[PDB]
Amino acid sequence: LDKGDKAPDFALPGKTGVVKLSDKTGSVVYLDFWASWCGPCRQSFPWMNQMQAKYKAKGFQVVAVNLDAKTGDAMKFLAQVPAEFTVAFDPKGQTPRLYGVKGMPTSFLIDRNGKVLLQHVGFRPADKEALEQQILAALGG
């Protein structure tokens, strides 16, 4: 996918029911691909929680697609780590291929129209400032 292309839609199981990218149309979406064994994911979660609470009123949603072989293991992770945003489970790892994911983690910022604005590989504290800047811009400043 290139900036501007439409983010492929999907329907994945959630903790509550089903999670569909399409249902998030209208809101800037921070789509994240993570797994419980990925150390950087332990740092990105507190931050994603921060962004979600800070920008949810402006029509912003974090959608975190988990890629653990067993959702049970991800549930363990979530039992210890707060995730105050939508979480989807893709045990077969079907969506990351659709998105051309090439690293773990990898996140995508999708605009209110459902088009890709950016693809971010990996996560380190130094990524927070630039990423929030991108979020803020997509929300209509």
Tokens of 60: 């912003």
Q: Enumerate the β-bridge partners of residue 89.
A: 66
Q: Taking Cα atoms as reference points, which of 105, 99, 109 lies closest to residue 121? A: 105
Q: Which of residues 56 and 140 has its CB atom nearest to a second copy in the complex? A: 56
- Show the binding pattern over residues 30-69: x = contacts a second copy (CB under 8 A), - = does not: -----xxxxxx--------------------------xxx
CB of 73 to a second copy, least distance (A): 5
- Indicate whether 27 belongs to the interface with a second copy (CB under 8 A): no
Distance CA 64, CA 62 (A): 6
Q: Taking Cα atoms as reference points, which of 136, 120, 134, 112 lies closest to residue 24? A: 112
95-114 residues near a second copy, rule: CB under 8 A: 96-98, 100-106
Report the residue from 13, 26, 46, 82 that binds a second copy according to the rule CB under 8 A. Answer: 13
Report the residue from 93, 112, 118, 132 that binds a second copy according to the rule CB under 8 A. Answer: 93
Report the residue from 16, 126, 140, 141 that binds a second copy according to the rule CB under 8 A. Answer: 16
Q: 135-138: long-range contacts at Cβ-Cβ below 8 A with a sequence spacing of 24 or more?
A: 135/28, 135/30, 135/51, 135/55, 135/60, 135/109, 136/55, 138/28, 138/109, 138/111, 138/112
Contact residues: a second copy, CB under 8 A? 11-19, 35-40, 67-73, 75-76, 79, 89, 91-94, 96-98, 100-106, 121-124
